């Protein structure tokens, strides 16, 4: 089962965020069995297939800001890091992990502008 440590993030304008998305890993991760999808309101952020990614399919509004952290991935955490968080980044993020079965979770991100 895919689990999330939390399903709501409130993150500061201009900061970096890491959204987590956990799945069961045994002694070692098998890339040949793993697909990860991160999506946000019809925008494709990460489309990871057995180790393979193609920047060309990443939605323009996440270019150079959004990546799947590979060290975490190796621990069963398909963590999406988004740098320089924008107000437009607020919304519902969806992760799908396929790894000995497919499951998914939804995560709300809110962006605050403290003063």
């Amino acid at each position: 089962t895919v689990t999330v440590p939390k399903d709501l993030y409130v993150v500061e304008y201009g900061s970096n965020m890491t959204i987590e998305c956990k799945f069961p890993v045994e002694k070692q991760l098998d890339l040949a069995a793993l697909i990860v999808y991160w999506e946000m309101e019809d925008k494709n952020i990460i489309q990871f297939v057995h180790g393979e990614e193609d920047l060309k399919v990443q939605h323009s509004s996440y270019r150079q800001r959004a990546r799947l952290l590979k060290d975490q991935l190796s621990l069963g955490n398909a963590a999406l890091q988004i740098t320089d968080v924008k107000l437009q980044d607020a919304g519902v993020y969806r992760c799908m992990i396929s790894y000995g079965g497919a499951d998914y979770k939804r995560i709300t991100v809110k962006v605050n502008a403290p003063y």
């Binding site: 999808y37 019809d42 494709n44 297939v49 990614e53 399919v57 969806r94 799908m96 396929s98």
Partner: peptide, 15 residues
């Protein structure tokens, strides 16, 4: 889905 070079849509659709 699941060609990494083609847009997907939620869930496991082609975009």
């Amino acid at each position: 889905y699941a060609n990494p070079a083609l847009p997907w849509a939620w869930x496991x659709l082609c975009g």
